[PDB]
Amino acid sequence: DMYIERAGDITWEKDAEVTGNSPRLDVALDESGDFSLVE
Amino acid sequence: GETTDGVYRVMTRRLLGSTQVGVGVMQEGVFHTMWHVTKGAALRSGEGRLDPYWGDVKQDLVSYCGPWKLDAAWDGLSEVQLLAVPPGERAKNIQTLPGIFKTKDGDIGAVALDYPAGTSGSPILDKCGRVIGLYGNGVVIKNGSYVSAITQGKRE
Numbered sequence: 001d002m003y004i005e006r007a008g009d010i011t012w013e014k015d016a017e018v019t020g021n022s023p024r025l026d027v028a029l030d031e032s033g034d035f036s037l038v039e
Numbered sequence: 040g041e042t043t044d045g046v047y048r049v050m051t052r053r054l055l056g057s058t059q060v061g062v063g064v065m066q067e068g069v070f071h072t073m074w075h076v077t078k079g080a081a082l083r084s085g086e087g088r089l090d091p092y093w094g095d096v097k098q099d100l101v102s103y104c105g106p107w108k109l110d111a112a113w114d115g116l117s118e119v120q121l122l123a124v125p126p127g128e129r130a131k132n133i134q135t136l137p138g139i140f141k142t143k144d145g146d147i148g149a150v151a152l153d154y155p156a157g158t159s160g161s162p163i164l165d166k167c168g169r170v171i172g173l174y175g176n177g178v179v180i181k182n183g184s185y186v187s188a189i190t191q192g193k194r195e
């Protein structure tokens with residue numbers, strides 16, 4: 001039996017730890033909801 | 040049960056100790072997660088119970104107590120925040136410019152941030168604090184890192 005615990009408000013926070021790249025990727029979505037890279 | 044808006048951990052006792060299998064959003068009394076987190080199973084909140092209402096394995100989304108409520112979209116330009124909720128660690132915002140998943144059916148925002156699988160369902164926000172989708176369904180890239188779609192449902 002799964003259960004839920006609150007972990008915070010949903011708020012934009014000024015001066016948060018900025019990071020991550022922005023890749024453009026060719027992907028396929030299967031019937032099972034699994035993505036995969038076309039190439 | 041606790042119906043306060045905000046972000047929630049999804050936990051199980053079915054493995055060793057308490058294990059966080061994912062995350063979700065409570066909004067307007069509806070709980071929103073990714074399908075691969077719950078598999079459409081019921082959830083406890085206090086001694087309260089949450090029954091599935093809507094789901095789609097292909098969208099990999101599920102709603103509890105009511106229909107999908109989150110209608111905001113990436114504008115295609117602006118930076119966004121992953122409100123990451125990783126296992127055992129405090130809620131932490133992480134700001135990023137989404138990339139793009141190109142598909143036969145269309146282009147989707149994607150966020151390149153590397154967190155454990157139990158972070159699945161953490162929300163992605165716009166500048167106005169509105170949830171534009173959920174993190175935790177995507178692909179493992181040339182580098183070994185994870186890239187997640189911005190997965191949003193439809194509101195009818």
Ligand SMILES: CCC(=O)Nc1cncc(C(=O)Nc2ccncc2C)c1
Pocket residue numbers: 033034075153154155156158159174175176177184185187
């Ligand atoms: C460390 C890099 C990494 O893999 N992390 C990761 C991050 N967010 C989601 C998943 C994931 O696996 N989800 C998922 C999608 C579709 N079906 C099942 C499942 C578990 C994994």
